[PDB]
């Protein structure tokens, strides 16, 4: 997260960390959508170009965390992955279209003041909130700035506005699809901020002024550099892929 700030305790209870067992490594962000399911970005699990193809037993998830690495009492929990479900049409060869994946936990996680699921948008919620100018919130333990040569101690958070599709399209040569949307401040809007490498899989949430609930409208997917004027972070369009999310959960839930 670039130009964000330290999150407050319990501010993002649905936040999940995706870790690689060996060698030990914090791979991506993710989100809790139920006591058994976690949402993340497909490329975090499968991305052939970088020779990445993880299986259930290569990873673990940590939930309820605030401080990246300073163990947290009877707060944080660890869970094993029973099964990984990557969207069958996830396009890793070209533009990361449908950059989404679900992970079923071996055992259900217990909710607490620090662990609580986020809501998935419904037809009306998406119609009301998915509008240019409307701000969402992004969270993660990823790079604090574009790096080509550091990472946060505590979860970072930043609020960014959704940007008009025409502007998103003209901002990059990469072909974009309706399965993604972009967010961030424009060059002269003053404010800054953006997600960055390591933040993928993390949620882009919005608080409904209609029912006071937090909804995950997107998943940190990609970008070109981090927080560069003229560029905008791209996110997987959760509502557009909700049909698939529900199918997986119903077919393989229990």
């Amino acid at each position: 997260i670039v130009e964000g700030s330290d999150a407050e305790i319990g501010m993002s209870p649905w936040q999940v960390m995706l870790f690689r067992k060996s060698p030990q490594e914090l791979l991506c962000g993710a989100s809790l959508i139920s006591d058994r399911w976690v949402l993340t970005a497909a490329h975090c699990l499968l991305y052939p170009p970088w020779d990445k193809n993880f299986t259930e037993n290569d990873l673990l998830v940590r939930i309820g965390k605030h401080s990246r690495t300073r163990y947290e009492r009877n707060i944080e929990k660890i869970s094993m992955l029973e099964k990984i479900y990557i969207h069958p049409r996830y396009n890793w060869r070209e533009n990361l279209d449908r950059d989404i994946a679900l992970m079923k936990l071996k055992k259900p996680v217990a909710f607490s003041d620090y662990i609580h699921p986020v809501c998935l948008p419904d037809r009306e919620t998406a119609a009301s909130l998915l509008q240019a100018g409307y701000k969402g919130r992004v969270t993660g333990w990823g790079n604090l700035k574009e790096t080509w040569t550091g990472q946060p101690s505590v979860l970072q958070v930043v609020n960014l506005p959704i940007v008009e599709r025409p502007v998103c399209k003209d901002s990059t040569r990469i072909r974009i699809t309706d399965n993604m949307f972009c967010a961030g401040y424009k060059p002269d809007e003053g404010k800054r901020g953006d997600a960055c490498e390591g933040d993928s899989g993390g949620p882009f949430v919005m608080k409904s002024p209609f029912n006071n609930r937090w909804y995950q409208m997107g998943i940190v997917s990609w970008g070109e550099g981090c927080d560069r004027d003229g560029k905008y972070g791209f996110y997987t369009h959760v509502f557009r892929l909700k049909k698939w999310i529900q199918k997986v959960i119903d077919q393989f839930g229990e």
Partner: peptide, 29 residues
């Protein structure tokens, strides 16, 4: 679940986080 999106330490105890109002103000055209 029917309890999704309501944070135990915030919405659940009628408390606002430091920046959520920024989001609300952005939802007003």
């Amino acid at each position: 679940e029917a309890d999704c999106g309501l944070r135990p330490l915030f919405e659940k105890k009628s408390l606002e986080d430091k920046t959520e109002r920024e989001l609300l103000e952005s939802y007003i055209d």
